[PDB]
């Protein structure tokens, strides 16, 4: 196999050679020459996600390494993983490209920020005051709902075998 | 043999009505799952691990890996969309006044707790406490703090502004007047709310405390969300367990196949392992898609409840709790929403003799908004959902026709308010 | 704006393109062309290679049918929702909040769209709100008066009764108020005259 | 065939997955009937007249 062999805190019984975790993967071993226990940590896998605007607009990208700490890989640490190539801004905007754990990215260079939920409004509540509307707005809004799909037929014999 | 329920023969007769003389403010819980665990699967790492030859053989199969990744990505964005639809229904973050006195009504169990670092309500904190290789779990786009903030904004809007904030700008109204508006919505006059304001407030506080005790004392209260977590975890576990399946080959380890057999048979054995693992992954993705459809339906229902029970008063029977619906309160929960439905339940009903119309002066009088009741000797008109007898006058009745057509009309006097004025 | 319908068209076209693309897969056989397999091998081993191709292509086709059925269920749910909106927003006026647009729903208009329907929801939104001093009831002659259909408001010196969703102050009379009980029970009752027509 | 079952055991928990899915559908049907028809906890009866 392939792995990182580190020191292990697992106390093997003298008859055991290999070690398995919950998911039945080999994660501990005992070296044949030396009767020490070594953990086989798998090589530091991560999902590489690329955050980019349209290529019509720009060619700048940012890279998110999922579940990888930033010291093991414009560098920002998120709960999703390490984001390289985007600069954290303490301002809050609407979400343009979702990153995760409250982090969103946008192009303005590529910035990463904690998305704002909404504008802050404090309602002037009191026990003896009411607010009554004096005017109205006739608002027309659009709602788009899909109804049907493309009706497809497949010739099973021709698709599998042709002629 | 299972018992359907207790028998209750209703004493139906042609001239008797039962009118409630009291009410119970009942708060009930409705738990709805909203989102699932967002899972991403590395097709190459799941099927082949680190074997370069396996990846080269895997490339011959085409876009199966792309299909599975695309389906999982669709489910992952769908979960965030579901949470956004259910909780992000207001674009203004409302806040409660510092002096949290709302007419005797207590909302401490549902408003956020300043003492706690998570800024959650006691009920929400209880809900969060009571819910417990190529594969990755993606974090949700909305954190628990932001979902709790959205619920706090919805609670502040529905407490300080009633249903006005859901249909436009938030218009402040005192909470007893809001509760009187809600009483009018279910057909009970506002005077009943104002006269019994202390009793209604006490009943509501008692019900909210009972809700917290009931959630804290029952293990199977939050099973619906727990099942979702269980279904996701078990599915993930099964998918990893499929890696330990030979699938009709000599070994489940690719390296053993390379070391023990020649390439003409080795290619067949790796092909068997690859097809078995790919079939396992396809089965997992299909299960995820079906569960995602179910959760999407549940999230759509939860969004409908949020719009129609929390942001307004609903006349739909049993949509927002058992009983006549007054209001609802949202609480964040792990992968879900809990609606506290505050409903009006009639109680302490009493028999009365009833008639369709009153015959006076050769004219038939019908109730303008109520019903005619008799306690045995005298006739009164009362509202249908609460017993409040009033004298039958020309102001609460209307005249249509004579007394010869209506079946069951009884003879009784109809008072005239104008008669003492011209008499004196 | 029209992302949902274009998205459905994109999924159907993409599924067909993927299904066509899957024919270029060897599936663990010597070639992805069936005619080559016949032209090159004896029937005992060519039968096995053709089998490898047939099971791969059949798995691809069943996968495509499975996602088609799942998408059909999703589109059927959306169509049932659209039929419900057409029945309750267009053919009637709905009291359901946010079912037929943001605001108090007045009426709706259906418009045909490729693979879809677009609802133009005409709604009433309150605006230009004003503060008023409010009371639950009016105490007059030792009797409590409650609004029949409105709410009591005060502009600072005078008390009026107005409808809840629009400011239209009217004089507090016996015609638009009803009497229940005395003034000793209602919390927050204020003293004002009630006019008699 | 006992040999077929021995060969079938090499494929893992496919059989358990299928049985679990069918069991979920089976309990779901009873839940559907319970939700639709058992909406009252009192068995009401009509008057004799
Ligand atoms: C009704 O009165 C209240 C308080 O008199 C107003 O609320 C204040 O509005 C100002 C202007 O935006 C804010 O700076 C204050 O912070 C608000 N106070 C509170 C306690 O929220 C309210 O705007 C008035 N309503 C209308 C329609 O004018
Ligand atoms: C209620 O709002 C409407 C607009 O929504 C106001 O109508 C405007 O009135 C001004 C002056 O009379 C005109 O210059 C605008 O062109 C009008 N707008 C429209 C869309 O017609 C109306 O005056 C408001 N009424 C009150 C009482 O404030
Ligand atoms: C209204 O009157 C009917 C009968 O006139 C009451 O029905 C009876 O209730 C008692 C108490 O459980 C039963 O034992 C009888 O068998 C019932 N009789 C019939 C014919 O059903 C009814 O309880 C009264 N309603 C109230 C609220 O007191
Ligand atoms: C209506 O019901 C409420 C309770 O549902 C009654 O309130 C109770 O009254 C008794 C004695 O009057 C007290 O000991 C209880 O503490 C009260 N309970 C609560 C929650 O306040 C009320 O009296 C009933 N009213 C009528 C007219 O029957
Ligand atoms: C609102 O309800 C809360 C909780 O039901 C009340 O807090 C309780 O107060 C008493 C006396 O101060 C304490 O003995 C309890 O331990 C408190 N409970 C909790 C959970 O903190 C509160 O007093 C009520 N009233 C107001 C105005 O908030
Ligand atoms: C039905 O209700 C009416 C009014 O509540 C009762 O009439 C009053 O009864 C009391 C009890 O003795 C008398 O002191 C009053 O003088 C009566 N008022 C009038 C205007 O007559 C009536 O008795 C009730 N009937 C029954 C059978 O309970
Ligand atoms: C209600 O009053 C009407 C008239 O005041 C009664 O009708 C009379 O009934 C008697 C005997 O049944 C007849 O002789 C009269 O000719 C009827 N008069 C009219 C105008 O119809 C009626 O019986 C009364 N109902 C009850 C239940 O007492
Ligand atoms: C509240 O509204 C009432 C009427 O809507 C106002 O009363 C009128 O005020 C005008 C000008 O102030 C006078 O010319 C009228 O004679 C008043 N009518 C009556 C019947 O007195 C009242 O002034 C308003 N109060 C405030 C504080 O704006
Ligand atoms: C509204 O009017 C009532 C009487 O019309 C006032 O009630 C009286 O108040 C005085 C002093 O507060 C007491 O000595 C009397 O015993 C009360 N009489 C009654 C029948 O309650 C009441 O205080 C007035 N309220 C306001 C806010 O002015
Ligand atoms: C095995 O070889 C290592 C190498 O230095 C030696 O230290 C050890 O004593 C040998 N024997 C055992 C039983 O480990
Ligand atoms: C009601 O029923 C009784 C007996 O069941 C009968 O005598 C009476 O006429 C009926 N009244 C009406 C209005 O049907
Ligand atoms: C409103 O609150 C003030 C102080 O908080 C109090 O004096 C007044 O009586 C209250 N009015 C009502 C109707 O609750």
Swiss-Prot record, chain A:
Residues the record marks as carrying a glycan: 56, 69, 90, 127, 135
Biotechnology section: Main component of the anti-COVID vaccine Chadox1/AZD1222/AstraZeneca; in which the human tPA leader sequence is added in N-terminus to enhance protein secretion.
Domain of life per record: Viruses
Subcellular location(s) per record: Virion membrane; Host endoplasmic reticulum-Golgi intermediate compartment membrane; Host cell membrane
Disulfide bonds: 70-82, 95-104
Modification note: The cytoplasmic Cys-rich domain is palmitoylated. Palmitoylated spike proteins drive the formation of localized ordered cholesterol and sphingo-lipid-rich lipid nanodomains in the early Golgi, where viral budding occurs.
Listed result of changing residue 23 to D: In strain: Alpha/B.1.1.7
Further details from the record: Variant D614G has become the most prevalent circulating sequence in the global pandemic since April 2020. The mutation is associated with higher viral loads produced in cell culture and animal models. It would not change pathogenicity nor neutralization properties vs vaccination. May be prevalent because the mutation increases virus transmission in human population.
Assigned protein family: Belongs to the betacoronaviruses spike protein family.
Domain remark from Swiss-Prot or TrEMBL: Contains sequence and structural motifs very similar to those of a bacterial superantigen and can directly bind and activate T-cell receptors. Activation of a broad T-cell repertoire may be involved in the hyperinflammatory syndrome in acute COVID disease.
Protein name: Spike glycoprotein
Whole-protein coverage range: 548 to 745 of 1273
Swiss-Prot record, chain D:
UniProt function note: Precursor of the fusion protein processed in the biosynthesis of the S protein and the formation of virus particle. Mediates fusion of the virion and cellular membranes by functioning as a class I viral fusion protein. Contains two viral fusion peptides that are unmasked after cleavage. The S2/S2' cleavage occurs during virus entry at the cell membrane by host TMPRSS2 or during endocytosis by host CSTL.
Record-given protein name: Spike protein S2
Organism whose genome encodes this protein: Severe acute respiratory syndrome coronavirus 2
Full protein segment contained here: 746 to 794 of 1273
């Amino acid at each position: 196999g392939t792995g990182v062999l580190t020191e292990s805190n697992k106390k093997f019984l003298p008859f055991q050679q290999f070690g398995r975790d919950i998911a039945d993967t080999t994660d501990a071993v005992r070296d044949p020459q030396t009767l020490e226990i070594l953990d086989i940590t798998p090589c530091s896998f991560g999902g590489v996600s690329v955050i980019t605007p349209g290529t019509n607009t720009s060619n700048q990208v940012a890279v998110l390494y999922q579940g990888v700490n930033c010291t093991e890989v414009n560098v920002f640490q998120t709960r999703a993983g390490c984001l390289i190539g985007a600069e954290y801004v303490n301002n809050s905007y609407e979400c343009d490209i979702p990153i995760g754990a409250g982090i969103c990215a946008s192009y303005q260079s590529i910035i990463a920020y904690t998305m704002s939920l909404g504008a802050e409004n404090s309602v002037a509540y009191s026990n003896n005051s009411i607010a009554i509307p004096t005017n109205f707005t006739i608002s027309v809004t659009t709602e788009i709902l899909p109804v049907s799909m493309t009706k497809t037929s497949v010739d099973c014999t021709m698709y599998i075998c042709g002629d | 043999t299972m018992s359907l329920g207790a028998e209750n023969s209703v004493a139906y007769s042609n001239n008797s009505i039962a009118i409630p003389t009291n009410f119970t403010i009942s708060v009930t819980t409705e738990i709805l799952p909203v989102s699932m665990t967002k899972t991403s699967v590395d097709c190459t790492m799941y099927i082949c691990g680190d074997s370069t030859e396996c990846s080269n053989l895997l490339l011959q199969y085409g876009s199966f890996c792309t299909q599975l990744k695309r389906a999982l990505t669709g489910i992952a964005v769908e979960q965030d969309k579901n949470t956004q639809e259910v909780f992000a229904q207001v674009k203004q973050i409302y806040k409660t006044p510092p002096i949290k006195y709302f007419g005797g009504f207590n909302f401490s169990q549902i408003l956020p707790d300043p003492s706690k670092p998570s800024k959650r309500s006691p009920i929400e904190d209880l809900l969060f406490n009571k819910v417990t290789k190529g594969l990755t779990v993606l974090p949700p786009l909305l954190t628990d703090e932001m979902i709790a903030q959205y619920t706090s904004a919805l609670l502040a809007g529905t407490i300080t502004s009633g249903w006005t904030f859901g249909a436009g700008p938030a218009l402040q109204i005192p909470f007893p007047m809001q509760m009187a508006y809600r009483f009018n919505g279910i057909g009970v006059t506002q005077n009943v709310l104002y006269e019994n304001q202390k009793l209604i407030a006490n009943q509501f506080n008692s019900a909210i405390g009972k809700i917290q005790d009931s959630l804290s004392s029952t293990p199977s209260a939050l099973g619906k969300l727990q099942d979702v977590v269980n279904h996701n975890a078990q599915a993930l576990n099964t998918l990893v367990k499929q890696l330990s399946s030979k699938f009709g080959a000599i070994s489940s380890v690719l390296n053993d196949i390379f070391s023990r057999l020649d390439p003409p048979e080795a290619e067949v054995q790796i092909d068997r392992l690859i097809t078995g693992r790919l079939q396992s992954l396809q089965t997992y993705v299909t299960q995820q898609l079906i569960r995602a459809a179910e959760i999407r339906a549940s999230a759509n229902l939860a969004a409908t409840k949020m719009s129609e029970c929390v942001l307004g008063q609903s006349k739909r029977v049993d949509f927002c709790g058992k009983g006549y619906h007054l209001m609802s309160f949202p609480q964040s929960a792990p992968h879900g929403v809990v609606f506290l439905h505050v409903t009006y339940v009639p109680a302490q009903e009493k028999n009365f003799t009833t008639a369709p119309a009153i015959c006076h002066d050769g004219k038939a009088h019908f109730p303008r908004e109520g019903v005619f009741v008799s306690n045995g000797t005298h006739w009164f008109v009362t509202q249908r959902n609460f017993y409040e007898p009033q004298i039958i006058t020309t102001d609460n009745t209307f005249v249509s026709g004579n007394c010869d057509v209506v079946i069951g009309i009884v003879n009784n006097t109809v008072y005239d308010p104008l008669q003492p004025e011209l008499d004196s």
